[PDB]
Amino acid sequence: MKITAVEPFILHLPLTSESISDSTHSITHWGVVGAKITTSDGIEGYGFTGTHAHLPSDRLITSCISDCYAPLLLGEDASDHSRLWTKLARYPSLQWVGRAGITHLALAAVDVALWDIKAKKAGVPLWHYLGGARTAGVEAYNTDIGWLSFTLEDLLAGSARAVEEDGFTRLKIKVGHDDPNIDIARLTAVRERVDSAVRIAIDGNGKWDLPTCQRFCAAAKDLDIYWFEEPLWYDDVTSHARLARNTSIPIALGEQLYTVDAFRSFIDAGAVAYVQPDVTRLGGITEYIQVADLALAHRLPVVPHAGEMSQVHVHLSYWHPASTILEYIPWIKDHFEEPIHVRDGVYKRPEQPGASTTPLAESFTRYGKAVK
């Protein structure tokens, strides 16, 4: 049906703690920056990217949606999401300043909105729309207990609680101290504290260089590390490729990669084992699927990064057959008409029509930010 409006929005949503840090960033709010797209039948779709809620750059994203993309969308058939992807992504003067960064992030929001419309119009949740479930249950792993800002006491207590009270069997812990031996001490303590059956991944958020990583990986050989995420600089294929061959610890990455080209480059190089596409980083669901299919072709597991806090990815992980486990961070879920829900370490299947990207009205009222 015809697109009748495109309306950008910004939400700045509070976190589990007043501030959290990884190796590289410290944040107080999560940005949900996106667009609401309405069709002539009254259907409203929502899509968004995920930011660190820095309002001046959030507004670059919304301005690209309103001023650059909206005129290319109004009056077009929303059904035609694959045609409209190319229309926007490769619009020549936008491509000139694009292919990555702001324009791509804004493209992601639009694309996801169109998919939310499609599934809404069909009257079914997206995972079902796309062709049904590949698993009886998508397992969660808990990232929220693992922030680098946590003192060791708090890291241990939260990790213990997740496992002993909340039924997680999979955690992810941040690393990235200037001296990695501090990380080794932290992980060693977590491993002594929790049951040996608990799987523990780690994430460096691109902090370290190749030689630092080689040493750390050798030092972590007995800690049964499930994967090491973003060990190195995001755009350095070759360093990842060298590291992967130097250790048995699997490398995970993808949350900072904007394009299918970039994923191809890392995958072909053997520089990534756990592939982490993100509909908020890549060009939406349309490009995510292409990356997932690339991963499948290499028989590599798809573990998407929670740029959208798994609101969209719970669908894609329930559906796409290369998928395995699913990141869990509970910061924003209660602000959606259909919150993700994890119990006993398993994500529930979405039930409402769409991609569970529709925020509560009250959340816009309370936490909406002006776009100009």
Place this chain on the structure above:
Amino acid sequence: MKITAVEPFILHLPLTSESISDSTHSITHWGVVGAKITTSDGIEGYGFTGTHAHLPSDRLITSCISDCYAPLLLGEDASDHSRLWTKLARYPSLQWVGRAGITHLALAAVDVALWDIKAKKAGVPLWHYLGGARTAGVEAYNTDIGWLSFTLEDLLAGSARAVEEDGFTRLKIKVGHDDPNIDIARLTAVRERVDSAVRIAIDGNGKWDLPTCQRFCAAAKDLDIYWFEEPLWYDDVTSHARLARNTSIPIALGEQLYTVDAFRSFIDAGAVAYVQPDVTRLGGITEYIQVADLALAHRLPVVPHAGEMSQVHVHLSYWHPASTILEYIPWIKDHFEEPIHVRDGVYKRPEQPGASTTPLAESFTRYGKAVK
């Protein structure tokens, strides 16, 4: 909606000539071998593979459909095509005798029928269902004027008529004489006879070995050969990789590859530049799309092989953005409710709901063969 019936069928359809040959095969009929699947809502989906109309082996495919797969489909929701693909393909005892060959051909027919249903239920042609058109017009190329069984006089007459009467500006001509210099002579004569702006691809159907191809390609350096399809034995990746590096002539292949894995092997090795997935050889549209995505990641053109005489691939080439041109062979199109149609070298865009796999009732009656 629930699947209430799965009924296999075989059509043996006559060709443009009494017999045609390429380097390897001589045939008098094309086999359309597949499944009609009915759902509880009265929708009827069709899908098929393509064979050389050898009845005893055609019945192997239909028996796998009725005897192996129908019990796993009856009563399932036809909507769940992704889940059902895994259910069938990976059914352990079938996988044991499968992963390729007869079981995969049968899987292809089922998977296409389920997509036909899905598009029919949505009330739209498959290309539109998938997300809209990537082009205003898919260009065709004519294979039917190029058979190896044609005398040079007839090869020339047909090629000239395609170009000068029918408006084709793209042809494919078979090669594969024992002495390739005969092919060079044939191609040289075609090149002298038709306008220089006619594009001419060639197809060896896997007849020659690596040294024979190296010499042939060097000898063909002034003939402006668009691609060299299946130059070497179908499962030999390395020989293709070495030829590709030895010549500027592009290599095309895919029509004999059963799996995404095989595609990945060839692509990653640099052993193919024109990727030729085929919904009748791969595990249907579901697996085709994965291969198309894989080729898109490598920025390589998708030019699918007409195993279904392009009745399905017209949709897929209208939609998938890596697609370029489309093989035309007019043998079966008049037996469908929506025939493909080419005018002035361009495929007509499909209009009817479904994947244009629905044969005319009267074509079953006249050309059907008993499945037992």
Place this chain on the structure above:
Amino acid sequence: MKITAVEPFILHLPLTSESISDSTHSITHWGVVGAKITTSDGIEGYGFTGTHAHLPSDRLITSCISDCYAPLLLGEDASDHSRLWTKLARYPSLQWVGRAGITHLALAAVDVALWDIKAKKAGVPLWHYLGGARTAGVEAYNTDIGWLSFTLEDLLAGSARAVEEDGFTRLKIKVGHDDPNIDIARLTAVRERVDSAVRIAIDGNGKWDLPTCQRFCAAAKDLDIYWFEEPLWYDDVTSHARLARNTSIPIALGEQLYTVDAFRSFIDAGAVAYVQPDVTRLGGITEYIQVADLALAHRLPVVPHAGEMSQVHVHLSYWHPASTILEYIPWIKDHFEEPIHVRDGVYKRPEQPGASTTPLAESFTRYGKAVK
């Protein structure tokens, strides 16, 4: 001598326990699916593939034999097994739907029957026919004690028994739990239970992905694992090549590879150390010998998978100079005119004319299935 009849058959034979499982399959019977080929001199040759005894698909193999291949065999000189291998394998309309899967499994059964005729006519067991013995004793390894379906208790009791009562010094144990640390625990217990001089290989039957295998293999570094069989997806060469370089544990594979081409791809990539051809999966003894010669040229060991419960491979392992040890599973032996036999961990050298593929007349009677 001229072939005068080709008669397919199916036997469904019971196992050591009522059900066994590995990482991927659970089965209750073994399918012996094949052909009896009679020559004008009254000699009867038997050859068969090995299936999971799924009757509907067993009948696809037998119908290929009777309806597709029998017409190409009747009247031919059975002596000409090399010429007839090509005649059948490359018959154009059948190659079109083959090269792998059902048509190749059927081909295997025919080929082995022709070899059985050749050795019977000569009056000698196959190993002798081929050129004599490479060893005075083919050592066995016991797979039947290691099924993934066994509880730790039973796994330990069976392993102890094979070693302590039955004189085995080589075992293979299945792995492939969702969490490989459960397999680490099982293996560690076996290692504690049996004498250190027992060689223990493992087999994942294709169940895990590359990063999972990397972590497992690092974790298994002290368990003295003899080989890790089918660690990854069967058709994924690259993942195997990366795993092989990441660990010192040798990789074994081949039971699922249909062709000499697939073996060459894995071997050339350094993706396999223990090469596992199977006459029931490859195109019979004919293609087996090609792959065994390929392995010899790489100075790699040939350790065939017991698709035929070693009834044929005992001959080939006694003869081919690259051969080493031989899988033992005792499920079907007692149904043959010459059962394999293992005493003190060594295979008895066969003595009767042929390839020891002739089943007892009573076992058709009791365990035969109708082919139609």
Place this chain on the structure above:
Amino acid sequence: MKITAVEPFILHLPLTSESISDSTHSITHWGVVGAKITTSDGIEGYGFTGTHAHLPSDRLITSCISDCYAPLLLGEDASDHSRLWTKLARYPSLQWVGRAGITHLALAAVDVALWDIKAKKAGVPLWHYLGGARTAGVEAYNTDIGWLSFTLEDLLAGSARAVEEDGFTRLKIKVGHDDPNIDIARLTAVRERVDSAVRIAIDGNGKWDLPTCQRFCAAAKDLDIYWFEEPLWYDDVTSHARLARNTSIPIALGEQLYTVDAFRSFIDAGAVAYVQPDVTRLGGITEYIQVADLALAHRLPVVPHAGEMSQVHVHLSYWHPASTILEYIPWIKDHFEEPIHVRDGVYKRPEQPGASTTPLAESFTRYGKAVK
């Protein structure tokens, strides 16, 4: 000296023709989009990126300068350009939505401005500031005669005039018709029309795929093509590496690469011979010099793309010892206090203090666009 103001600007400057096209873009104006930075001593520095004068996206770049970066610049010592490059480029919440695209183009404008200040404070032109001249004359090549939008007649006329009247001996001609043989015809005609000692490079602006390029390059074997710029998709390293190996024609690229990492991927793969950094695309002069040094280490020539119509690159090419020739397009030069000037195919060496980025005052009033 302290930075006291940061003021963005947009100029839309008319071209030589009403419209021009390459294979991908059609434009009527050139966008000079940047920042004027004032220090407490009264020095004003100018820097800018280069756009296709699409006002809604130009304003994303300005809004990044004023709303994201100015607050990080006000009160800092302008002299600290290397420290400030990092402060802005790696500011956590901006890196989150950057590393490429709009944030990087804005960084480039700021960086160039701070270099302009530096050389203005020192009272010397940039090339002298950086350490003196590597050549007595930088040779020019004329791109403005070769647009794809030119008829053959006009391409010939203009090329002839550049060479016969204006004293150029180096030209660049666009290619990228859907059928490359039209380009071969065009080039063939140009080669006939102009003297044989005229060097002719070509530029596809990323239009074609690998196989198309392989065939074109073979067919261009006698045209003496100096380089083939952007033959393939901008982010596809592998296709470029494969092409570079397949032809003797040198590959040129860089104008679309945002980072040193991207350049290093292409250079290390042997995917580029003529390295084309651009201060308007990379993060300004600071990042350009890194890339030029990287090219030097590989002994490859540096031939920067005219994103700033060579107002800045004339300095960098007079200084950096890896530099060779310099693109010339005369669209904006007369709008500057020190226009570039080419006589007899050689650039005048700049004389005024600064980076020749200062527009004439009347430029802003006549061609300025409002930033909101």
Place this chain on the structure above:
Amino acid sequence: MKITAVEPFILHLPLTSESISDSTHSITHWGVVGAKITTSDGIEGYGFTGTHAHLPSDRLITSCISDCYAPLLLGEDASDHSRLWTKLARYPSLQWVGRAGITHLALAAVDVALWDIKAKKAGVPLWHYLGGARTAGVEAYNTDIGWLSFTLEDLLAGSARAVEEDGFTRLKIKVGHDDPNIDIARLTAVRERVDSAVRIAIDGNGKWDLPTCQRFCAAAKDLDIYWFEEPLWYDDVTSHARLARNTSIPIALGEQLYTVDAFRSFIDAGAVAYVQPDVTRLGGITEYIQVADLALAHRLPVVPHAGEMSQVHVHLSYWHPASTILEYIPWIKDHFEEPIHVRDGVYKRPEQPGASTTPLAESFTRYGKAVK
């Protein structure tokens, strides 16, 4: 300003001990061998290489400065350091006998002098001149406690004092006994004596062969070695590449590499992780910056070798963004107008105008050697 005089000098400065040794050399003095260059404004710039104070070869370097290079410098504008680098380095008859060795060490002294002038004329320390500080503090590592000539007792004493009294948390210890197990013993003792958070690098000074290194690195697996510097022969890229792949211990090198080309060979081969350019070995600051930029493009750390006891490299490490830590050896610092100074393991940021290369006037009279 014009160069008016070029005057070479030699200082022989005493060390911390009467003699020191590494695996290859024993020395009693450090040679500061360079040039004082005077301009017409009265500014005097100093630059030097670093020798083992062998007077007959020191005088080859001085004689190159005075007899080969001064005539190419007198009357030139000192500001033109990049042009002059080329004029000298590539002067045809000197390049003939150069590109490395004595002519290159002399070039390095001249180049550093011209940079010293530049920063002195601008009235600022070099690090500020080049664009400001990348860090608030450059960390030091102490090499002077680790000489191979130290008994185990003295190695332990000094290491303990550096850490416990002087506040170092980073040390470098020489290795290179004929039997590396003596070094393993030494290191093992050091690791026991000092706190576990002390980082310990090692340096073999090119003493051992590949197999010796492979075994040592394996045996050093629990010693937490930060890097292994110059493990192998200085010009043997391949052995270094093979070693780097065989161990998780990072390789460091560069102090013996004269050119950017050599660095690029090692970096591209993956033969070095810690890049160690030295202004006294490469052609001064000009060539150092090229190599540091090359390392940046590979995201590798730059840790320059103290050929000038870090008098110059303190500036380059405060500025260049790829820099990490800085070698400290206190032998000569007190002989300079601005000594380097380390407190609590951190270098003071230089304050005086110039490159801190200016010796105290009384240095020449007390420690000067005659150049003829």
